[PDB]
Amino acid sequence: GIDIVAGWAEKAGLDVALARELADAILIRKVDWVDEITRVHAAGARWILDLGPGDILTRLTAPVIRGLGIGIVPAATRGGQRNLFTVGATPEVARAW
Amino acid sequence: ADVAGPLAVVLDAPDVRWAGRTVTNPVHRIADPAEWQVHDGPENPRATHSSTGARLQTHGDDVALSVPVSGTWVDIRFTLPANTVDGGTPVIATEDATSAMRTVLAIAAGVDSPEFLPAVANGTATLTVDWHPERVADHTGVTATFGEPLAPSLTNVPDALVGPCWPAVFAAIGSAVTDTGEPVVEGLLSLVHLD
Amino acid sequence: DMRPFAVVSGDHNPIHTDRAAALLAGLESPIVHGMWLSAAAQHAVTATD
Amino acid sequence: SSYAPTVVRLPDGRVKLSTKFTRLTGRSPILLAGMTPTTVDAKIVAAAANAGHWAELAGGGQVTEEIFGNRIEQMAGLLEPGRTYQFNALFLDPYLWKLQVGGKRLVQKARQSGAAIDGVVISAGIPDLDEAVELIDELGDIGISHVVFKPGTIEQIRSVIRIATEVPTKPVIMHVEGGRAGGHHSWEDLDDLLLATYSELRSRANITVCVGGGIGTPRRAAEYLSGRWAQAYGFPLMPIDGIL
Amino acid sequence: HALVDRLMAGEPYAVAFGGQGSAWLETLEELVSATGIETELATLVGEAELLLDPVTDELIVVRPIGFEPLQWVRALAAEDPVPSDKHLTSAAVSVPGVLLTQIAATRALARQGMDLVATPPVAMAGHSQGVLAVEALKAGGARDVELFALAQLIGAAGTLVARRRGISVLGDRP
User: Fold this and answer.
1) What is the number of CB-based contacts under 8 A between chain B and chain E?
2) H helices present in chain C, as ranges
3) Is the CB of D145 less than 8 angstroms away from the CB of B14?
4) Quick check: B26 contacting C, CB < 8 Å?
5) What are the chain E neighbours of C3 within 8 Å (beta carbons)?
6) I need a labelling partner for B69 at 20 to 30 A (CA). Which of A21, A33, B81, D93 fits?
7) CB D238: neighbour CB atoms within 10 A?
């Protein structure tokens, strides 16, 4: 499929190198989430925002930031936006282990 | 009751002669009652249809209805004899039907009618095509869309070799002939798959 | 829409896809390919459970 | 007075008459009515059609499939290309109506096959609203475009008016025949029917009125077509669109 | 917006981008109805369609409907029939749809007062597919059309190839 995407990119009016690299990243190579979250934490991110649809990443990331003292607040959601934009209501972050 | 000339004659007439056969007027068939706006700027009256993009250009003492089918245009020429003055239907000569139906056949089969559809030998039309079994998978992706319990068979369904052979069958239809008569040009638009 | 079947199969007959050609052919609306029905019935008869 | 006939000039220099019937059909306002004894043969109907007149082929003589097919064949043979003819169908005769229109769609099949039939006349009474409307749309679907009802009495004409009202878009043609008509007999005078109904007739804009019965010499037809016939009863001009 | 006030004043934060199987249509419709970014999203979709005009013939093979997301959200907001769940889960319509939803979320947060370039997030967290949204946000909003275009391309190609192999869903079992 990578060469199919490359051929469609060349036939179209956009570049091929980024096309092949995105296709490889999204179709072929294995993604690792625990190490990505650890890199995010090592960057010092005290809060993380999930801009993806719904809150599947919210329930999928909480076990990974379970005891690191990193806060989570959903985005693209009514409750998440309410938590983000209201002074008197912010989500609670449990004590770091 | 707002235009004149051959354009009004073609627009008003409900019946036409399609190669020795009385059929409904194609301009009527597209949209019957006074749905064609007219323009008389440089004094060459023309009528167009909004929802289909049809046109009614006039080549002097002639009227042609042009229809955008898929990217391309089909042109049918109306011949107006003196009979049409009082109750005579417009005559669509056989060669105009040949041209229009050959363009439609090219649309249905290939790119253009002249020498792009496969040529016909003494009796037959032959083609040489490439075959890929994964095209069977991409065909059954759009064909087999039943419910949850069923699943497509592991073997290729027989309705897969019919794909590449369509241009040959359309060329054979185009070169088909009855007992002194060709069923390619009279009713290609009315053609349907029987069995 | 029957354009996907038209492109995968190979017959681009406008009566199945276009509206103007469907009106010209004498049909109110475009009709599905009959050979689509043939292939669907074949898959139904060869479906595995 | 706006319904009075108008004289137009054809491209070849000929001079004709322009009533709304001629505008609807593109033929002369003079109609050759269907005739159970006489217009059965194709000679007279074909000769009338070739002259540019509303020609009727009577369905009372086409009593089986074979003669129907042979008559259609010889009709196509006689007619010069571009000329079209009409058809007369009896409604209250069950066998012929079923054979031609209702049960076996011989007229419909002939038109679909490519016959020059451009009209159907529903004679011998009118249908009720429902199936009359179904007939109108069906015959329009096959491509006839001229469905004609010929009522006999005032109530029949009013029912045809109701049928036309139910379908304000499609145009209808009426053949109002008087009592002095030949063949089967009606006991109603044409003038009385026209006096009683002309107002409702001209109220609807899709109704074309052709009258017949008692029209002999062409002078009578001329005086009837100009509306001067109503002067005898102390009425304003009451023009019509054609006579059969 | 105390959390937003803290983040503007400076608090190390990151943004995560969702992946596959998240029912993007409902969240996208809620976002568009609450905010009103329909004009910008419509322009984005129109430019993407104009970008990949030559590849419509091969691309229509895998989408029975055609991926008109704006029409679908407009219909859903009007309580009109919507495409079936199978026709929305399909990759050729999913992987562009979730990316469009993510871009709409970013634009909605930017309009609401959360600017992501004044205070760049410390880390770019991208899930299985989010890598393309990470690429969109790593630069400005000047490459979104191109990445939407090849998002459509890769979704169509993925559906096509997974049907070529046995990697596609057979029956109920995904």
Assistant:
1) 19
2) 3-9, 14-17, 20-24, 34-45
3) yes
4) yes
5) 60
6) B81
7) 21
In SS3 terms, D94-155 reads as HHHHHHHCCCCCHHHHHHHHCCCEEEEEEECCCCCHHHHHHHHHHHHHHCCCCEEECCCCHH
Residue D21 near residue D241, CB atoms below 8 Å: yes
Which residues from B are below 8 Å from C26, CB to CB?
A: 24, 29, 189-190
- Is the CB of residue B188 less than 8 Å from the CB of residue B74? no
State residue D10 phi and psi, 5-degree precision. -80, 160
- List all residues 6 or more positions away from E84 whose beta carbon is below 8 Å from its beta carbon: none
CB contact at 8 A, B183 and B190: no
Instruction: Give CA–CA dist E39/D234, Å, rounded.
Output: 72
Radius of gyration of chain C (CA): 13
- Do the Cβ atoms of E171 and B134 come within 8 Å? no
Residues 6+ apart with CB under 8 A from D183: D35, D36, D37
Do B136 and B156 touch, CB atoms closer than 8 A? Answer: yes
Q: Is B157 helix (H, G, I), strand (E, B) or coil?
A: coil
- Min CA distance, C49 vs chain B (Å)? 5
Nearest CB to E170 within list B137, B142, B151: B151
Q: E57 contacts in C (CB within 8 Å)?
A: 7
Chain E: give the shortest CA distance to residue B139, in Å: 9
For an interface test with B, the pick among D17, D53, D86, D145 (most B C-beta atoms closer than 10 Å) comes out as D145
Q: Do C7 and E57 touch (CB under 8 A)?
A: yes
- What is each CA distance from C33 to B77, B144, B192, C11, in whole angstroms? 30, 14, 9, 9
Q: How far apart are CA E65 and CA E59, in angstroms?
A: 11
| Minimal C-alpha gap between B131 and chain C (Å) | 13
Residue type, D78: L
What is d(CA D171, CA D31) in angstroms, rounded to the nearest whole number? 18
Q: Report how this structure was experimentally obtained.
A: cryo-EM
Residues of C whose CB is below 8 A from B105? none
**Taking the CB of residue E174, how many other CB atoms lie within 10 A of it?**
8
C-alpha to C-alpha distances, B158 to B161, B166, C7, C39, D242, nearest whole angstrom: 7, 15, 18, 8, 64
Which element (helix H / strand E) includes E76?
helix E69-77
Interatomic CA distance for residues A14 and E104, integer angstroms: 23
Residue from D31, D73, D75 nearest D51 by CA: D31
Residue of A nearest to E16 (CA): A50
Of E160, E170, E171, the CB nearest to B138: E160
Strand order of the sheet with strand D54-58? D31-32, D54-58, D85-90, D117-123, D147-149, D172-177, D207-212, D242-243
Describe the crossing of helices A17-27 and E144-164 by its angle, rounded to 10 degrees.
50
Taking alpha carbons only, the member of D200, D86, D91, D72 closest to residue D135 is D91
CA of C12: which chain E residue's CA is closest? E57
CA distance B176 to chain C (A): 18
B81 touches chain C (CB under 8 A): no
CA distance D29 to D6: 12
Resolution of the experimental model in angstroms, please? 2.8
